Amino acid sequence: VINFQGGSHSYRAKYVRLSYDTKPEIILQLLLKEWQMELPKLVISVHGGMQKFELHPRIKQLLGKGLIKAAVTTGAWILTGGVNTGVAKHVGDALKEHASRSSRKICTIGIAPWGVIENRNDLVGRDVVAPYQTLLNPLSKLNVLNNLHSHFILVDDGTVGKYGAEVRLRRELEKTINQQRIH
Amino acid sequence: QKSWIESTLTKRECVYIIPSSKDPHRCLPGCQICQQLVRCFCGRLVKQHACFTASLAMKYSDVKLGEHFNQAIEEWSVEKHTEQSPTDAYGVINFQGGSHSYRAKYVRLSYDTKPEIILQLLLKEWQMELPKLVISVHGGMQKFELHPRIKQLLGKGLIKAAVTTGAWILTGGVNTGVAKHVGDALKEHASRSSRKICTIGIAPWGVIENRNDLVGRDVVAPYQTLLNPLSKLNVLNNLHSHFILVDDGTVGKYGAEVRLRRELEKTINQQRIHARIGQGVPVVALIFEGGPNVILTVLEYLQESPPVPVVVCEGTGRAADLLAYIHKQTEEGGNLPDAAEPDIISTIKKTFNFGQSEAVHLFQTMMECMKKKELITVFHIGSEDHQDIDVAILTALLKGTNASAFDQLILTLAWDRVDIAKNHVFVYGQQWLVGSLEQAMLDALVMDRVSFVKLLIENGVSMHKFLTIPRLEELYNTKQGPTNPMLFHLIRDVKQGNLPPGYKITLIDIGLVIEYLMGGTYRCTYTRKRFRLIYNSLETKRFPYPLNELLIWACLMKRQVMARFLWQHGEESMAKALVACKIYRSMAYEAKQSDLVDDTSEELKQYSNDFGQLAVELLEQSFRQDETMAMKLLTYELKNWSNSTCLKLAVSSRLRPFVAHTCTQMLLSDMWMGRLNMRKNSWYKVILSILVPPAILMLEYKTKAEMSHIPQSQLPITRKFYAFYHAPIVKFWFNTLAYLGFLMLYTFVVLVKMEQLPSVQEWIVIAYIFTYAIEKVREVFMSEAGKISQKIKVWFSDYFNVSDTIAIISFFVGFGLRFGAKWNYINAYDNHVFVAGRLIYCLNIIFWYVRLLDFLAVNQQAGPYVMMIGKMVANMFYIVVIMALVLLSFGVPRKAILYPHEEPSWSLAKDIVFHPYWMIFGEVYAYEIDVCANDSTLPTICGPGTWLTPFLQAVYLFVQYIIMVNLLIAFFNNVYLQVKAISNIVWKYQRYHFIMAYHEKPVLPPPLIILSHIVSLFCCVCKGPKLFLTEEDQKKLHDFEEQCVEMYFDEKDDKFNSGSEERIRVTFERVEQMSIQIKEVGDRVNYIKRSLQSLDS
Amino acid sequence: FVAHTCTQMLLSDMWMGRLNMRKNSWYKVILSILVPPAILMLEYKTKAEMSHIPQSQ
C-alpha cells in the first residue's frame, strides 16, 4: 500500500510489480479476489498525451464534474497510466476537485511500466507500507505516480527506462472484463 | 517609595539658557523682547524653561559669561546641560470624543533609559505578554493620502498578523505620520474584538500636542481628539494602546526616539519566544509611503547582525513604491545589469525634490539595499502575490534569513499557523536534518498543537520510530499544556507512600494507574515483566502501536481534542474509544468521590460519553456495512488491551447502548440457543424436553453450515443430546427447575417439625447448598484470568454473590449446630444449640427466595422491575434516616410521659421504637391514645401529663405518615420513571450477564453438578465469546474498521453541511461577497458608460 | 452565584483549613478527634499552599 506522504491526508493506493506475461485471468483474480474490488458496470479507459500539458481552468472543473459522475453513478473502473507525465495527472485533478468519492468509492487503476517509475526502490518489499515523496519540482517531467489513484499494476518487462510493456496487459484487461456478466 | 515608575524613570529639563541660536534678536525694545520671543536651543522660550535656575535666569541675568564665547554657544547638549529627575507624565490617556473614548497607557522618560528598564516597563509594569512577533511600521511623517481599496486591504492583513501572533506593532504614535493609518486598520475590522493587539507608539515628548494634560502622577489625563482634520499637528492617535514618549529635555525637535525604538527591537529579539523554542522573538519592518530618511532606515536594518527583513508595500509613489520599482529592475545578484540609471534617477526626483546631487546619493543607498533582496519583499496589490499581506509579513521571517528548516518550522508552531508552514515550509528544497521533524513532533504534542501533529504525520513523520520510552515519559511529565491535576494524586494513591519532591512520572506508575482505572482483571503492558526487564535496562525501546499509547496519554492528561485526533489514526479504533470511555468514567468517579466540589467529574463524565457514543456509532456503521465483520469486531481478542474484547470493555463502562445494539444481541442469542434453532415458544419446549428426554429429538437444530460463522464460537441421535444439554438456555431451565425443587423441599423442612437426624428432604437440601458452594468456588478461580485478589474483588461486586456467600456460610453454621448438638432433652427445644441451628435455617431461607428475583430477571418484563427495586433500596437511606429521627422524636417523649417510674432496661429501647414504627403503616393504636378515657385499654397508665401524648401522636402521624412516607414514595416514583424510560435497554444489558453466566456453567445443576465436577478435574490431570484471529484476518478486520471510520466522518460531515444552520451561514457569507461583486459591477459599469461618452467624441 | 465553582473552591479551603485530605475526610477527622495521635498521620497544607486563599485572614 503506497503512503503518498505529503499529499492531503497522505492517500493510500495498493501496488504490485508483475510481468507483462501474466495470464489475463490471474490479473482478474488480483483485482477482484485479492484487492476485493467489485466487478464494475463500466470501464473507462483514459488515453492521452504522455507529456506535461496545459488545460484551461473552465474545462478543468467542467471535465472533473462529469468523468467522476460516470464512474460514481456506475461503479466504473477508470484506467490510466498512473504516472503524472501523462493524462493521469489530470484525472487526478478531477479527483481532487469535486471530492472524488465522498464515501462513494471510485476505483482508478493506473497500469504503468515498472522500469520508469520514479523511486522504484521504495515500493520494494513483501506487503510493505512504502511511503512515497509526492512533492518533487512541479515543472520537472519525471515519472512520478499520481497520489490520488487507488490502485497500481506496475508492469514489469525486466528493464529500466522504456515504456510500452503495458500496452497489451491493459487491453487484455479490457477484453477480460468485457467477457464478464454485468449482473 | 514602592513606586517603580517614579523611582526608576527620569525626566530631563533644560537648565541652561543660551540665546535662540545666535544674537538674541533686534527690535528696539531690546532687553524687552528678550522676554517676548527669545528662546534657547532647548526649544522653549524664556518662561517655558521654568527651571529653578532658569527662573534665576528670569530676574537679573542668565547663566553664562559677560559676552559668552561661541564654543559655549555650541556647548549645549541634552547630556551635560539637562538635569535628570523623577518623572511627571504617566497614567492612562482618556481620548475624550473618540468612539467610547479609548484608553492608552503613557509615560515620559528620557532617551538614555537602559534597554532593560524599558523591557521591565512593557512586560512587568504594563503586564504585557512577551510577543511572538514585532512589526515595526515606518513611513512618511507628513499627512498623506491612501486609496480606499488599499485602505481596507491593508487593515485586514496587518491586523491578522498582529492578532494571529500576539505581535507588538510599533509606530511613532503621532497622527502626522504612518501611525494615523495604522489607526485606520484598527478602527476598521474592529481591531481586536476581544483578542488584544498591543501597538506601542514611541514618540518624542517635545512635539506632542497638549503636552501639559499628560503631566501628573498616575493621572487619568483626558485628551482632545477632534482638532482640525487637515491641520498637521502632532496629535496622538486615539486607537493605540500604549505610548512611550521619549524625552530629550527639549521642545520642537524629533529624533530622540530613533535609538530607543531600535534598542527595544534588539531587546525583544534577544528574548526566548517560548520555553522550549530556542529562538528569538522575530522582528520585521513594514514601510508605508516612506520619506527620504525611511530609505536609509531600510539599509540600517539590512546590514545589522542579526538582520531584520523589510516588507515594502506599494502605493502612493514614494519610498514604498520606489523600492518596489527598483526591486523589479535589479538582477538576482543585486546590481542593475542594464544602463538605465538616469531614468531611475529621474524617478527619484519626481518623488524627492533634489535636482541631481542628493538624487544620486539617494540612489547610492538603494543599490546596496538591492544587494540583499532576500530580506526585502514587495506586496503589490494588483496581481495579488502571496494572497495576503498577513502571510507576507510572516513569510518574510522565513525566507532570506538563511534559517534552518527546523527553525522555519518551529516558528510557525509558536505562532500556531499551519497554513504558512504547509505552504511555505513543507516544499521541495528543504533538507531536514536527522531528527528535526521528530523534535518538532514532541514540541507539537507537548504544546497541544493538533494541527501540526496532523501536518507532521502527513509530511513524513513515523510515530513508530518517533515514540520511545524516554519521549513518552517526557510527555507525561510536562506542564506546558493542558494538564490533569488528578493524575498526580492517582499516582500517589497507587504508590501507597509519598514521593521525593522532583519525582518524574514513570510508565510503570502509569501502568498501575491504568489498572486502577480499568479495574476488574485488566493488566497493562507496562506492569508486565517483559517491559520491566526492558525499562530497568534503559528496536526494543520503541512501541508497536504508538497511537494506542498516546491516546492513553491524552486521556490521562485530560487532553481531549488531542485524544479525538489520535483516535482516528491507527488501528483498533473501536477498542480505543471504549478504553477512553472507561478511563474517563473512572476518573469521573474518583472526582465525584473526592472531598472537592467542582465541575471535574461532569467534565470527565462528558468526555467518557463522547467516546462511548463514538463506539456505538462505529458499531452501527460496521453493522450496516457487514454484519459478520461487525460481530468479529465485538469478539476478537485484544492482545494490546489485556487480552480482552470490545464487548467486555463496553460492559466494564456500563455502556448499555453498545450492549443493547442489535449486533451484540444477535451474538448473544446465538450463544444462548447454541445449536438449537427454535424461533418461537422455546421456554416450554426446553422444559418439557428436560422432563421428557425423547422430546429432545423433536426439536430443531442448527446445521453445521449455520454453526460455522458464529463469530464468538469456540446430525445423529447422540449429538442431539449433547447439543441440547450444552445449550445455555437449557442449562438455565434445568438449573431453574432444580432450584425451585430445592426451595420447595427447604420450605417443607423449616415448616415441618425437625427431628434428631435430618429427613431425606433436609439431606437433599444440604447436598444442594454444599455442591452449589463448590460451584461458586470454581466460578471464582476459573473466572477471567488475573490475580486472585482481582478475581475475588470482581465476584464480590455482584449483589447475589454476596448474598449467596452469606447464605452458604450461615447455612453450615446452622447445620453444624443442628447436627452436632447433643440432646440432653427429649423435647428437642429445651436444647438451645439445636434451636439456634433451626432458627438460622428459617432465616437463611430468605436469601434463597430473594435469589429467585435473579432468575425472574431473565424475563424482559420482570427484569427492569427488579433493577428498579434495587435502585429504590440502595438510594433511600437518607430519607429513612430522617424517618428514624422523626420516630424517636415521638417515641422518647411518649414513653417518658406515660412511664415515669422506669429503671434502666433494654426494654426502653424496644418501647421507644415499637409502636411508633407500626404507626408508619397506619396502626394508630386507637384505644391506647388517650389512656385516661373510659374506653382505654391502658387505664393504669392514666397519670399526670398523659393528656399530652394525643397531641404528640397527632403531630407525629401527620409528619411521618403523610409527609415522610409520601416523600419516600415520591423518590420511588422517580426511580420508576427513570428506569421505565430505558427499560428495553436495561434488559438487553442484563441479557449479557445471564447469557455469559450460563454459558460457563456445567450441564448439571447443583445437586448432580458434583459429577460434572468429579468428571472434569480428572480430564485435566489425567489428560467466553472470544475470537482468536490469525494475523492475516486480523489485518483484514483492521482494514474493515478503518473504512467504517472514514464512512463515519463522511456521513457526519454531510449531515453537518446539510443542516439549516450551516446553510444559513454559508449563504450569509456568500451573499456578503456578492454584494461587493455587484458593487464591483456597479462600479465598473460607470467605467464603461463614461468611457463610451469619451469615445462618443 | 453561590453554587458557582469559584465560590465552592473558596468555601472548601475554609472548611478544610490547613488540612489537605482529598478523600474520606469524615472518618479521618472522627478517628483523630477520638485518637489525638492520629492527628499526626494526616495530610497538611504547606504554607506555600496556605498563602493565596483569597479569604484567608
Ligand SMILES: CCCCCCCC/C=C/CCCCCCCC(=O)O[C@@H](COC(=O)CCCCCCCCCCCCCCC)COP(=O)([O-])OCC[N+](C)(C)C
Ligand atoms: C450515633 C447515632 C447517630 C448517627 C446515626 C448512625 C446510623 C446511620 C445513619 C447515619 C446518618 C448520617 C450519615 C452521614 C454521616 C456519615 C459520614 C458522612 O457521609 O458524613 C457527611 C456529613 O455527615 C453529616 O452531616 C452527619 C451529621 C450527623 C447526623 C447525626 C444524626 C443522624 C441519625 C438520626 C437519628 C435516627 C437514625 C439513627 C438511629 C438513632 C459528609 O460525607 P462526605 O463523605 O463528606 O460526603 C460523601 C460524598 N462525597 C464522596 C462527594 C464527599
Ligand SMILES: CCCCCCCC/C=C/CCCCCCCC(=O)O[C@@H](COC(=O)CCCCCCCCCCCCCCC)COP(=O)([O-])OCC[N+](C)(C)C
Ligand atoms: C415457570 C415455572 C416452571 C415450572 C417449575 C416447576 C418446578 C418443579 C419442581 C419439582 C419438585 C417438587 C418436590 C419438592 C417438594 C416435595 C415435598 C413433599 O411433598 O414431601 C412429601 C412427599 O414425599 C417425599 O418428599 C418423600 C421423598 C423424600 C425426598 C424428597 C424428594 C422429592 C422429589 C424432589 C426431587 C429433587 C428435586 C430438587 C433437586 C435439588 C412428604 O411429606 P409427607 O409424606 O406428607 O410427610 C409425612 C408426615 N408424617 C411424618 C406425619 C407421616
Ligand SMILES: CCCCCCCC/C=C/CCCCCCCC(=O)O[C@@H](COC(=O)CCCCCCCCCCCCCCC)COP(=O)([O-])OCC[N+](C)(C)C
Ligand atoms: C467463593 C465461594 C462462595 C461460597 C462460600 C464457600 C464456603 C462456605 C463455607 C462454609 C463453612 C462455614 C463455617 C461453618 C462452621 C460450623 C460452625 C458450627 O456450627 O460449629 C458447631 C459444629 O461444628 C462442627 O465441626 C460439627 C458439625 C459438622 C460440620 C458442618 C459444617 C462444615 C461444612 C461446611 C461446608 C462448606 C462447603 C464449602 C464448599 C466450597 C460447633 O458447635 P456444636 O458442636 O454444635 O456444639 C455442641 C454443644 N452441645 C453438645 C453442648 C450441644
Ligand SMILES: CCCCCCCC/C=C/CCCCCCCC(=O)O[C@@H](COC(=O)CCCCCCCCCCCCCCC)COP(=O)([O-])OCC[N+](C)(C)C
Ligand atoms: C433503635 C433505638 C433503640 C436503642 C438503640 C440501641 C440498640 C438496642 C439493642 C439491644 C440489644 C442488647 C440488649 C440485649 C438484651 C436482651 C434481653 C431480652 O430480654 O431479650 C429478649 C429479646 O432479645 C433477645 O433475645 C436478644 C436480643 C435481640 C434484640 C436486639 C437486636 C439488636 C437490634 C438490631 C439493630 C441494631 C441495634 C443498634 C442501634 C440501632 C428476650 O425476651 P423477649 O423477647 O421479651 O421474650 C422471649 C421469651 N421469654 C419471655 C421467655 C424471655
Ligand SMILES: CCCCCCCC/C=C\CCCCCCCC(=O)O[C@@H](COC(=O)CCCCCCCCCCCCCCC)COP(=O)([O-])OCC[N+](C)(C)C
Ligand atoms: C441466616 C441468618 C444469618 C445472616 C443474617 C444476615 C443479615 C443480612 C445481611 C446481608 C444482606 C445481603 C446483602 C449484603 C450487601 C450487598 C452489597 C451490595 O450493595 O452490592 C452491590 C454494590 O456493592 C458491592 O457490590 C460491594 C459491597 C459489598 C462488599 C463485598 C462483600 C464483603 C463481605 C460482606 C460485607 C457486606 C455487607 C454484608 C455483611 C453482613 C452490588 O450491586 P450489583 O448486583 O452488582 O448491581 C449490578 C448488577 N450487574 C453487574 C449484573 C449489572
Ligand SMILES: CCCCCCCC/C=C\CCCCCCCC(=O)O[C@@H](COC(=O)CCCCCCCCCCCCCCC)COP(=O)([O-])OCC[N+](C)(C)C
Ligand atoms: C463467618 C462465620 C462466623 C461464624 C462461624 C461459626 C462460629 C461458631 C458458632 C457457634 C458455636 C456455638 C457452640 C456452643 C457455645 C457454648 C454454649 C453452649 O454450648 O450452649 C448454649 C448455646 O447458645 C447459643 O447461642 C448457641 C448458638 C450460637 C450461634 C449464634 C449465631 C451465630 C451464627 C450466625 C450466622 C453467622 C454467619 C454469617 C455469615 C457471614 C446453650 O445451649 P445448651 O448448652 O445446649 O443449652 C443450655 C440451656 N438449657 C439448660 C436450658 C438447655
Ligand SMILES: CCCCCCCC/C=C\CCCCCCCC(=O)O[C@@H](COC(=O)CCCCCCCCCCCCCCC)COP(=O)([O-])OCC[N+](C)(C)C
Ligand atoms: C423477611 C422479610 C421479607 C424479605 C424482604 C423482601 C426481600 C428484599 C427485596 C429485595 C432485595 C434486593 C433486590 C436486588 C435486585 C438487584 C439489585 C442490583 O443488582 O444492585 C443494586 C443494589 O441492590 C441492593 O443493594 C439490594 C438491597 C440491599 C438489601 C436490603 C433489603 C431490604 C431491607 C431494607 C429495608 C427495610 C428498612 C426498614 C427496616 C425497619 C444496585 O443499584 P444502585 O446501586 O442503586 O444503582 C445505582 C446506579 N448508578 C451507578 C448509576 C448510581
Ligand SMILES: CCCCCCCC/C=C\CCCCCCCC(=O)O[C@@H](COC(=O)CCCCCCCCCCCCCCC)COP(=O)([O-])OCC[N+](C)(C)C
Ligand atoms: C412557646 C409556648 C410555651 C408554652 C406556654 C404555655 C404553658 C402551658 C399552658 C397550659 C397547659 C395546661 C395546664 C397544664 C395541665 C393542668 C392540669 C394539672 O395541673 O395537672 C396535670 C399534670 O400536672 C401538671 O402540672 C401539668 C403541667 C404541664 C406542663 C407544661 C405544659 C406545656 C405545654 C407545651 C406548650 C405548647 C403550646 C402549643 C404549641 C402548639 C394533669 O394531672 P392529672 O392528670 O389530673 O393527674 C393524674 C392523677 N392520677 C394519678 C390519680 C390519675
Ligand SMILES: CCCCCCCC/C=C\CCCCCCCC(=O)O[C@@H](COC(=O)CCCCCCCCCCCCCCC)COP(=O)([O-])OCC[N+](C)(C)C
Ligand atoms: C436432576 C434430574 C436428572 C436425573 C437423571 C439421573 C441422573 C443423571 C445425571 C447426571 C449423570 C449423567 C451426566 C453425564 C456425566 C457427566 C459428564 C459431563 O458433565 O459432560 C461430558 C459430556 O456431556 C454429556 O455427555 C452430557 C451430560 C449431561 C446430560 C445428562 C442428562 C441427564 C440428566 C437430565 C435428563 C434425565 C431425565 C430425567 C430428568 C427429568 C464431558 O464433559 P463436558 O460437559 O463436555 O465438558 C467438561 C470438561 N471436560 C470435557 C474436560 C470433562
Ligand SMILES: CCCCCCCC/C=C\CCCCCCCC(=O)O[C@@H](COC(=O)CCCCCCCCCCCCCCC)COP(=O)([O-])OCC[N+](C)(C)C
Ligand atoms: C470533650 C472531649 C475532650 C476531653 C479532653 C479533656 C479536656 C480538654 C479540653 C479543653 C481544654 C483544653 C483547651 C485549651 C484551652 C482553650 C484555648 C483555646 O480555646 O484556644 C487557644 C489556642 O488554641 C488551642 O490551644 C487549641 C485548643 C483546642 C485543642 C484542645 C483539644 C482537647 C479536646 C479534644 C482532644 C482530647 C482527647 C479526648 C477526646 C476524645 C487560644 O484561643 P483561640 O481559639 O486560638 O482564639 C480565641 C481568642 N484568643 C486567641 C484571643 C484567646
Ligand SMILES: C[C@@H]1CC[C@@]2(OC1)O[C@H]1C[C@H]3[C@@H]4CC=C5C[C@@H](OCCC(CO)CO)CC[C@]5(C)[C@H]4CC[C@]3(C)[C@H]1[C@@H]2C
Ligand atoms: C441519637 C440517638 C439519641 C437517642 C438514643 O440513640 C441515639 O440514645 C441512646 C442511649 C440509649 C440508652 C443508653 C443506656 C442504657 C442503659 C441500659 O441499662 C442496662 C440494662 C440493665 C437491664 O436490667 C442491666 O441490668 C439499658 C439501655 C439504655 C437505657 C439505652 C436505651 C437506648 C438509648 C436511649 C438510645 C437512644 C435510641
Ligand SMILES: Oc1ccc2c3c1O[C@H]1c4oc5ccccc5c4C[C@@]4(O)[C@@H](C2)N(CC2CC2)CC[C@]314
Ligand atoms: O436477531 C437475529 C436475526 C437474524 C438472525 C439471527 C438473529 O440472532 C441470531 C439468532 O437468534 C436466534 C434465536 C432463536 C432461533 C434462531 C436464532 C438466530 C438466527 C441467527 O443465528 C441467524 C440470523 N444468523 C446466522 C445466519 C447465517 C446468517 C446469526 C444471528 C441470528
Ligand SMILES: Oc1ccc2c3c1O[C@H]1c4oc5ccccc5c4C[C@@]4(O)[C@@H](C2)N(CC2CC2)CC[C@]314
Ligand atoms: O475544587 C478544587 C479544585 C482544585 C483546587 C481546589 C479546589 O477547591 C480547593 C480545595 O478544596 C479541598 C478539599 C480537600 C482537599 C484539598 C482541597 C482543595 C485544594 C485547593 O486549595 C487548590 C486546588 N487551590 C490552591 C492551589 C494553588 C492551586 C485552591 C482551591 C482548592
